[PDB]
Write a protein that binds this ligand. Sequence first.
Ligand SMILES: *[C@@H]1O[C@H](CO[C@@H]2O[C@@H](C)[C@@H](O)[C@@H](O)[C@@H]2O)[C@@H](O[C@@H]2O[C@H](CO)[C@@H](O)[C@H](O)[C@H]2NC(C)=O)[C@H](O)[C@H]1NC(C)=O
Ligand SMILES: *[C@@H]1O[C@H](CO[C@@H]2O[C@@H](C)[C@@H](O)[C@@H](O)[C@@H]2O)[C@@H](O)[C@H](O)[C@H]1NC(C)=O
Lengths: 21, 21, 117, 593, 107, 17, 17
Amino acid sequence: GIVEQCCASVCSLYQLENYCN
Amino acid sequence: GIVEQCCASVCSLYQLENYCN
Amino acid sequence: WEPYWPPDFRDLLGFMLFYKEAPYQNVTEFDGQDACGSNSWTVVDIDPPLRSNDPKSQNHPGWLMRGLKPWTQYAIFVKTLVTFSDERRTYGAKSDIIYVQTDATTFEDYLHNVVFV
Amino acid sequence: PGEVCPGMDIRNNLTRLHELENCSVIEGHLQILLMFKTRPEDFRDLSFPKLIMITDYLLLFRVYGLESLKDLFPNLTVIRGSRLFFNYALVIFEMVHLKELGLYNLMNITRGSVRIEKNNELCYLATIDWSRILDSVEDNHIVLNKDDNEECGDICPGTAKGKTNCPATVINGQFVERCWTHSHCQKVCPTICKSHGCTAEGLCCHSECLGNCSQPDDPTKCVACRNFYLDGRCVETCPPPYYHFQDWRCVNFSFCQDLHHKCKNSRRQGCHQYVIHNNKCIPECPSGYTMNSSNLLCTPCLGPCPKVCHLLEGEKTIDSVTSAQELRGCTVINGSLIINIRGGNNLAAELEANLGLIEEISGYLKIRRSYALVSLSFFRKLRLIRGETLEIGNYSFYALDNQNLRQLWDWSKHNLTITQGKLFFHYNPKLCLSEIHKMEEVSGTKGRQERNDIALKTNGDQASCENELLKFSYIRTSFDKILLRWEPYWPPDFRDLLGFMLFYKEAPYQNVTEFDGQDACGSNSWTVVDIDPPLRSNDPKSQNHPGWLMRGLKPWTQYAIFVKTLVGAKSDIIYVQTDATTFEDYLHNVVFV
Amino acid sequence: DIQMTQSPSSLSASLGERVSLTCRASQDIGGNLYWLQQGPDGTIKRLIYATSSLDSGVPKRFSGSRSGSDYSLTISSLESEDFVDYYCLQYSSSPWTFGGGTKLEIK
Amino acid sequence: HLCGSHLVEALYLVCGE
Amino acid sequence: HLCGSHLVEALYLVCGE
Ligand SMILES: *[C@@H]1O[C@H](CO[C@@H]2O[C@@H](C)[C@@H](O)[C@@H](O)[C@@H]2O)[C@@H](O[C@@H]2O[C@H](CO)[C@@H](O)[C@H](O)[C@H]2NC(C)=O)[C@H](O)[C@H]1NC(C)=O
Ligand SMILES: *[C@@H]1O[C@H](CO[C@@H]2O[C@@H](C)[C@@H](O)[C@@H](O)[C@@H]2O)[C@@H](O)[C@H](O)[C@H]1NC(C)=O
């Protein structure tokens, strides 16, 4: 999950991009 | 490892601090 | 690896790739009886390639091994599927055992982890 | 009066929002979110006055420029909450610019709670009496809005100001006037009206109405229904020949049938295949039921229910007992199977336990390098391969390099149909072409049509198929033993005769075969003896008939027995029953304590 | 969020009088309620834990009780030092919440 | 690092739709 | 994001020993 990828974690500036709708 | 924490990964601006000698 | 073509090049069907985690030297085909069940060799069935004419038909059969441990030596070899041939019978060709070691850490990267807690 | 629309998810731009322009009812949810460039002007001339009801939930998140919902959804009366967003039927979150809700026609939220949070300009919240709209307000979460601070100047009075205007209700001890905006009061009906609604004059709507009506005590004049809707009327239950659908409307068989029909692929969120059960048209049969195909009707299962297994990427490779187990209970495979079994123990039984219930495979079946298999009979119930997907070269059944395969299925008993695609057989050394040819006949991979890449030289080349018959010249029973003799076998050049093989198992009646419960490698279905070739002893009287003495047999037990010549001739299956008690000796033991 | 409704918000009484303050829980909180006392200097002190258990040092004239969803603090015989502020607090569920307070004043 | 309401913001910095 | 020779640099930005 995005919460799990960047909040209860840290997400790469690209990981963050990818699924931008 | 620090390589594994920030290179083959992404490390939090704090994770990065912690063990600064 | 090389494409295999029997005398009458017609109906080429299959390759077989074998790989195991190996130390040094001491590796053989007829190793620890594969028989039926518990196996001594990791095995892949490789579909025969599509020739795409006579001039430049080396659309070299290959394989992507995944699920390998890093900094690990692998005994690897290919074989052509066992063919009952017309007249003087031949299955064909097997490659030699090559050892291939997966990548490990860059020196630079060993240093880092060491030099920085 | 207008359309029933499906649930929608509107983001980024207002463009797709106009898809709601003719909906009276949204059968699903409505989410409007993430519109960062919108401004008040974009909403000034935007209205959906036809929308009366949402069956699930309404969610609004980060929609910029929107200051009120009074013009967008002026007539939204009921949110049913059949499906909820995390227990909420109404969600208003981070609506920067929203000054009031203004849903002045919202009378009932049938199920679920309200979550209104982090709306920095939001007022006209203290003025709403939610106890008129929801049965329980205990789970409402209305926090972090402008209303939390000392800045809301909520004003209901406008016409005369403070002289006979909005209805007032109590919070704890304080009476509060109740309104949605400066120009719209909250509708409050007499208690006798319950949730049915009332006219402006205070006259109760009909008991089948929900929230509001145009005329009192008339079930054809409701704005919305308490129970079900049919032909401009609110009804308690759907009358024949109609079915209850999505817990709010009556539909006919044909409608349910249209939904059901063949949503070709999209099994994973985009099909369901609707069924009939207890006068409801529903997404799927409940537990204990299965669907009678010709009339969409759920019927109780004869024993355990059929089970459709959808494979990841449309395929699965079975290379072990463990992988086969993942299909235990399946009766239908949606996808294709690849069998790659090289070894193990008691495989025929284990494979039959896990794969024996499969009746249909929608794609193809491929058996390849399955060294361990002697038969495919473990696929006990397999009757159909559709070939909706095929192996490259348009094959629906493919058998390659199976070194011990001697049987496909027993074609005297088994029927298998192959709708589409071709057959492929190469490098099956123990499989006779007769078995393959029988399969073509049975399966309808008919010889009037197109090819099947079947090798003449690499199928059965290491097998002599049945050919000659060995006959038993002598049979002798003992209670514990059986002594047999049988014809000597001599090939064309009689030279170097080496071996016979005698098979015997404890058998009941008739139902015994050679290619039974895959002997393969390990746990066996047959007791076997290797019989050394005899010594001829010249030409005149050379019948020094090979034989064998079976010992270790149970008494009064039937034995299936047959002989074979090492890979010529096999004998037929004879049943031999070991001796039992003499009548005299049954008598004694009975007649003397 | 569990809402704790504290009543009365203010109370006038005299020395030696018996008084009760109530907190009603919007959801069942079982026995997980504290009673807090705030001095005019701002110091907060806990008097009751687990609805009825008196903390060490607290005079025995203080008692806590429960009836339905009503949790009560009772001062059996008021002393001059008791004319201060009181707050209930629930710890039964994740957002800890407080009653609105009662100021006890001299009649 | 990234969290709460900020993720939504962080994303529109990168999105700009 | 962070890597190679840059980690060493990244670290001294934060260290400043
Ligand atoms: C492979 O041989 C090793 C050791 O033998 C030598 O080293 C090899 C790398 C190769 O060069 C051989 O020709 C040499 O003779 C055997 O290793 C044993 O491994 C177990 C592992 O726990 C260990 O306990 C033993 O001490 C090792 N034996 C020795 C003599 O070192 C291994 O069995 C050989 N394997 C095969 C398949 O031949
Ligand atoms: C609302 O209904 C409108 C009706 O469409 C009109 O009639 C059809 C049969 C065609 O002639 C069409 O060209 C006309 O515009 C739609 O235009 C409109 O898109 C519908 N609302 C939605 C859901 O967008």
